[PDB]
UniProtKB/Swiss-Prot annotation, chain B:
Positions with a binding annotation for Ca(2+) 2: 112, 114, 116, 118, 123
Recorded name of the encoding gene: CDPK2
Mod. after translation: Myristoylated; myristoylation may target it to different subcellular compartments.
Region ranges (J domain): 13-48
Residues reported to bind Ca(2+) 3: 146, 148, 150, 152, 157
Residues passing through the membrane, by range: none
Organism: Plasmodium falciparum (isolate K1 / Thailand)
Residue numbers of the full-length protein present here: 335 to 512 of 513
Protein name: Calcium-dependent protein kinase 2
């Protein structure tokens, strides 16, 4: 009542995606590819309304025209999309970046990327398995630094592996 | 062909292909045939690496042996249901690869015989090749895809059919 805030869940997630850790971003992409239309219905409807040229992708102009036809945080998102390979955000990546914890933060949902990452099925993501998510396990000191930084942040018990409880906690954060 | 990238949706896509509407299945088959090396290289590298007998087809044992070589009752179901190179490609390509205007315009234009921008019932009949069930299935497909109710499928409706899950 009076002057209030009805914040956009879709925009909050969209601006937060880039800054999420690299494991969470891939887990969110896997989740987005597995959720059915009933679970992402609001995001699908918005994407269709914005995708005026039916390209299956959104440009910065389509997103900008939507904030008009229908802040520094949203302006940075537009510049981040302009800077990527195609100058666009594909449907799947848009869903990954906009899906909310209310939808994804559930054991049944997070088990989808977790089981995929856990190659041997021992309930833990080893350093080798973790490296295999991002690139070839044969080829770099920058890769080792990124893995070490990812492990510090996620491997709470410091046993050099990622269990399901640690995976759920990381998925909830930020 | 030695180093490959396995997607989280490869097996799920293989299983769900038969369940897709018939126009989407043909559109994916046409798309699979046109996608450039860079787009299909990886899926081709998986197929070849799994095709141990050089028959240009994949057996139930071949797929299971591959997953084992790398390191799911849904996977066992598709396994019980050969698979040629083109059909494997059509059934494994993800939206990030096929859901692009330039890619989807290829089957759309092939289906749009008169080039008017819409796929008609008569164009649908030609795609699918006396039986009342054919005309019924075409009508049930048209009503699911024809969002504006004009009796025809435009590109917007075709793109929405292509992204639907
Ligand atoms: Ca677009
Ligand atoms: Ca493991
Ligand atoms: Ca741990
Ligand atoms: Ca074979
Ligand atoms: Ca036509
Ligand atoms: Ca129509
Ligand atoms: Cl269009
Ligand atoms: Cl059908
Ligand atoms: Na990271
Ligand atoms: Na659904
Ligand atoms: Na259209």
């Amino acid at each position: 009542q009076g002057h209030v805030e009805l914040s956009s869940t879709l925009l909050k997630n969209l601006k937060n995606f880039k800054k999420e850790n690299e494991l969470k971003k891939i887990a969110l992409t896997i989740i987005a590819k597995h959720l059915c239309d009933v679970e992402i219905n609001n995001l699908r409807n918005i994407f269709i309304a914005l995708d005026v040229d039916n390209s299956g992708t959104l440009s910065s102009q389509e997103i900008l025209d939507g904030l008009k036809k229908i802040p520094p945080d949203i302006h940075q998102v537009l510049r981040d999309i302009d800077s990527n390979a195609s100058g666009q955000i594909h449907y799947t990546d848009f869903l990954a970046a906009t899906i909310d914890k209310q939808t994804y933060l559930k054991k049944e949902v997070c088990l989808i990327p977790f089981k995929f990452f856990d190659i041997d099925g021992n309930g833990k993501i080893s350093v080798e398995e973790l490296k295999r998510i991002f690139g070839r396990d044969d080829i770099n000191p920058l890769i080792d630094k990124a893995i070490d930084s990812l492990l510090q942040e996620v491997d709470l018990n410091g046993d050099g592996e990622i269990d399901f409880h640690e995976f759920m906690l990381m998925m909830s954060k930020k």
